[PDB]
């Protein structure tokens with residue numbers, strides 16, 4: 006007898022779904038585990054046309070984002086979060102069972118999940134001790150690679166990748182692979198974006214999202230910025246109607262000139278709060294080291310991190326365990342929330358210190 | 360020199376994106392080309408939690424739909440329309456370059472588009488003259504097939520597939536392939552659903568949507584109904600956060616007991632309007648034949664169909680040309696809208712008749 010499971014693809018049977026979830030509804034009161042902006046920003050629907058299909062690429066959203074990002078509208082694609090952008094790039098450039106993607110741990114886990122699910126080889130070149138790119142390592146492992154993902158600023162470590170090294174990576178991949186700069190957190194350090202480099206690199210693509218600084222993770226709205234040739238290829242593999250009208254409606258509102266002003270205020274707010282938390286953490290006994298951050302989260306190494314994580318977890322303070330990540334033994338990632346939430350973390354940590 | 364296009368997958372370079380679009384903004388006043396409910400049903404957001412990520416599978420949506428469909432919650436998956444359900448099935452059961460899908464033209468075009476884009480062989484077995492399944496043909500072309508798609512009622516022809524033949528198809532595929540009954544239009548003939556057959560067939564999957572009878576195409580919300588084993592496999596390949604909160608919010612509202620009552624009223628409305636249009640069309644000179652329908656659209660063969668289509672198009676009456684579809688020479692698909700819209704069609708057609 007043949008089971009339904011026997012009919013599934015081998016890679017699908019053996020893969021482990023992305024570990025995003027880690028809930029405890031009505032149990033935790035302080036959520037600093039998903040890099041979400043801490044407070045809700047309200048939006049209401051303005052377009053009651055739900056009986057009709059939306060545009061594949063809502064014009065107002067594309068144009069408002071292009072204006073905001075400083076790129077041409079033809080260089081923008083909107084999708085269901087940066088997560089879908091990751092998928093589209095593999096779907097368009099990586100032949101299953103032939104081509105591979107390359108990423109550098111420790112970093113965002115969806116690059117690997119998407120490739121493994123689609124059936125594309127995952128090539129890894131761990132970053133250096135300070136999490137900067139191992140350029141020599143990458144240079145000798147590019148055969149068969151079609152897409153390279155580099156998160157900058159990096160999640161979960163928090164630092165920016167030296168642009169001088171992005172220059173090198175872009176040269177190494179010229180005429181060989183698409184370089185994807187994941188800028189999910191670039192709003193917190195806008196001057197470091199590679200968006201203005203498009204005219205120099207035909208193979209450069211950039212991932213953006215409304216889930217973090219924009220405080221709209223619930224909208225599942227992201228973008229890919231690239232030269233027209235790349236955008237048009239991605240448009241050949243995207244679903245016909247990837248964005249719902251309610252999302253196009255509210256996303257456009259959030260990207261209005263006033264919306265941008267508000268987003269920048271949110272960034273300033275988070276940066277000021279981040280610096281408070283960083284300074285405070287460094288003084289806590291159970292904290293061994295706090296790593297520099299250019300995002301809305303902080304990576305810190307703790308003494309008995311698993312004990313600390315479980316202790317805060319039971320207290321309703323939900324963080325993100327990084328102990329199993331390469332090079333991140335003893336590290337926990339703390340999202341920057343409100344001052345009160347930072348104080349909850351600080352006070353709880355001071356309660357450990359053995 | 361290597362171009363960006365040279366880096367794209369061969370199948371991606373050669374494929375032709377799905378032909379959904381056919382717009383003429385502010386030019387057409389009567390839209391009967393996408394099988395959308397003709398009037399907007401208003402919904403407002405009730406959950407201002409947009410800064411937080413949604414659940415992968417919003418509980419209220421899953422439970423409300425399960426209740427409505429008469430199946431167990433564990434037998435339901437929610438996605439970005441039935442379009443994504445089509446994708447998930449290929450993604451979970453079809454190994455690119457090894458396995459194939461099978462469908463029977465003329466039918467919905469996304470089965471082929473998804474398979475071709477992913478890189479899975481498309482096996483076709485045209486339906487018979489009356490668009491019923493060519494069972495003998497299918498029986499001899501199942502080698503390597505992992506997923507079979509059958510739209511019932513069928514788009515664009517409008518008729519139901521004889522359940523006696525679904526029984527045969529299910530036996531032919533037992534322990535070999537997943538049979539997917541596309542029930543995007545089952546709300547118009549609910550008694551014909553195969554949802555109650557799940558306990559008898561481990562390999563049966565059903566596609567459902569909120570885009571038609573539910574009048575919520577703008578929400579991009581669909582479902583897949585199947586036995587738990589199948590649902591769980593599909594859940595291994597779906598994106599971590601496939602549904603936005605605004606959509607989960609409003610979809611749940613539309614699936615409330617009162618929402619179901621309203622949907623059924625919409626169905627009754629459309630059926631009554633459909634019968635009016637069918638009866639009227641048959642009498643028009645330029646109409647050669649009107650085919651039976653159990654949906655919210657009517658397929659009809661016309662004399663000089665291309666002339667008729669262009670004529671109405673220029674008059675602001677937008678239909679869906681089927682002239683290029685196998686066996687559908689001279690046919691146009693007319694969505695059932697309001698009485699006024701049906702009259703516009705009837706009056707325009709009577710203006711031809713040469």
Ligand SMILES: Cc1ncc(COP(=O)(O)O)c(CN)c1O
Pocket residue numbers: 039040085086087088089113156160187189212213214215216222225226227228
């Ligand atoms: C580095 C990184 N990239 C991309 C994403 C996805 O962003 P999205 O909510 O637009 O699908 C995330 C969200 N955790 C992320 O951390």
Ligand SMILES: Cc1ncc(COP(=O)(O)O)c(CN)c1O
Pocket residue numbers: 393394439440441442443467510514541543566567568569570576579580581582
């Ligand atoms: C037969 C059929 N199946 C599936 C779909 C997709 O439905 P959705 O708007 O839920 O992605 C459609 C929409 N035209 C359809 O006609």
